[PDB]
Design a binder for this molecule. Structure first.
Ligand SMILES: O=C(O)[C@H]1O[C@@H](O[C@H]2[C@H](O)[C@H](O)[C@@H](O)O[C@@H]2C(=O)O)[C@@H](O)[C@@H](O)[C@@H]1O
Ligand SMILES: O=C(O)[C@H]1O[C@@H](O[C@H]2[C@H](O)[C@H](O)[C@H](O)O[C@H]2C(=O)O)[C@@H](O)[C@@H](O)[C@@H]1O
Length: 231
């Protein structure tokens, strides 16, 4: 039988502040249901320690979406509200099966757009350099489709072992720290000033696969939204 993520203590804080969306953005499990032992092949405890997400299909997901804590509704915050918004994780990205090409593992998203995607990607060239099997950040600085709307950065080559991430937003600036080192230092998010619908996400969101039956799989050793105001 499949062991439930809530059977250990590690993820209870974030489960109390998230809903699970699967296999689309449709609700799969409320925060209460997650804390109550919701489990399936898409979302279960692997190795007695990892919150594991699995999903197949282009643009499908198995993803946590930040909620107001203690049974609250969907959160919305703004890059320019003056508060520091922080998400931390420790992630084991396994080798992905053929047909999986890009898997978004953390986001800042709003009602209409992804401000930030951290994604594993099989192969991509950035600024004239080819990279394989790596973790990328994609920041939107506009809503258009041309390259001037994005800042894309190689964060790290994929490691077999756990990799730590931290996302911080304060005063319209974004910092991404990977394995303790700052890789994105104060990226401008001021295009999004006044958008009050931002929230964190984490899990597996499957982008541009070449087979819709190929199952993406991501293991979280830790995940939290860190509240700088201590409510
Ligand atoms: O053609 C691309 O791969 C294009 O995708 C962009 O990311 C999109 C994702 O693939 C998903 O469709 C979803 O998350 O929307 C994203 C978006 O529209 O921002 C960027 O990665 C872009 O650089 C790239 O050209
Ligand atoms: O699937 C999408 O295109 C986006 O869905 C978003 O979730 C919202 C959506 O209205 C859902 O049907 C449900 O109501 O939850 C909403 C929400 O939590 O904001 C996000 O999952 C977004 O990341 C997707 O891009």
């Amino acid at each position: 039988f499949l062991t439930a993520v809530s059977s250990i203590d590690t993820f209870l804080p974030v489960l109390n502040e998230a809903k699970l969306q699967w296999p689309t953005s449709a609700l799969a499990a409320s925060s209460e249901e997650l804390l109550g032992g919701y489990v399936g092949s898409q979302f279960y405890l692997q190795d007695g320690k990892y919150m594991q997400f699995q999903i197949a299909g282009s643009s499908n997901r198995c993803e946590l979406r930040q909620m107001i804590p203690d049974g609250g509704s969907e959160i919305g915050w703004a890059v320019d509200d003056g508060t520091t918004h922080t998400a931390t994780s420790s992630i084991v990205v396994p080798e992905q099966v053929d047909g999986v090409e890009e898997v978004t593992i953390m986001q800042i998203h709003s009602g209409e757009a992804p401000q930030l995607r951290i994604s594993w990607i099989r192969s991509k060239s950035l600024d004239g350099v080819a990279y394989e099997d790596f973790i990328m950040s994609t920041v939107r600085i506009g809503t258009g489709d041309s390259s001037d709307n994005f800042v894309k950065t190689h964060l790290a080559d994929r490691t077999a072992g756990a990799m730590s991430f931290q996302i911080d937003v304060k005063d319209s600036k974004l910092t991404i720290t990977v394995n303790g080192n700052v890789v994105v230092n104060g990226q401008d998010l001021s295009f999004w000033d006044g958008t009050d619908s931002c929230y964190f996400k984490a899990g597996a969101y499957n982008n541009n696969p070449t087979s819709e039956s190929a199952t993406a799989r991501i293991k979280f050793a830790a995940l939290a939204w860190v509240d700088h105001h201590h409510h």
